[PDB]
Ligand binder design. Structure first.
Ligand SMILES: COc1cc(-c2cn(C)c(=O)c3cnccc23)c(OC)cc1CN(C)C
Length: 117
């Protein structure tokens, strides 16, 4: 049993992950694979962490998940240099995700979520 908000967050997450077929952002970045990461990025974020916050009913709004998604992309553009594959992939994923999490779409979900209460 999940709330209408949780299920909306899940379908949004499914579409966001559709824009990352390489699974660069599926799991947390470790210092082992990216040395000094924990010293450079103060608020790490990834898809699996966001999915756990959905599962635990941590998000009170779609905008909070939108904030976490922007943070995950921004983190990769801080740690990685502009020509790297990870920077370019985060740049493109952020732009694609902002179209998915547009105000127009958040609108429609808020009303249907409200109508199920
Ligand atoms: C290339 O393969 C991967 C890359 C990254 C990765 C992501 N981001 C955002 C980074 O900034 C980053 C920076 N340095 C090194 C690696 C990464 C990854 O993160 C956990 C996992 C894989 C393995 N994958 C098959 C699951």
């Amino acid at each position: 049993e999940q709330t209408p908000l949780q299920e909306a967050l899940n379908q949004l997450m499914r579409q966001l992950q559709r824009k990352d077929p390489s699974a660069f952002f599926s799991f947390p970045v470790t210092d082992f694979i990216a040395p000094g990461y924990s010293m450079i990025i103060k608020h790490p974020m990834d898809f699996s962490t966001m999915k756990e916050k959905i599962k635990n009913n941590d998000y009170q709004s779609i905008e909070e998940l939108k904030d976490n998604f922007k943070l995950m992309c921004t983190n990769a553009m801080i740690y990685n240099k502009p020509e790297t594959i990870y920077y370019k992939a985060a740049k493109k994923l952020l732009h694609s995700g902002m179209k998915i999490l547009s105000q127009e779409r958040i609108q429609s979900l808020k009303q249907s979520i409200d109508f199920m209460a």
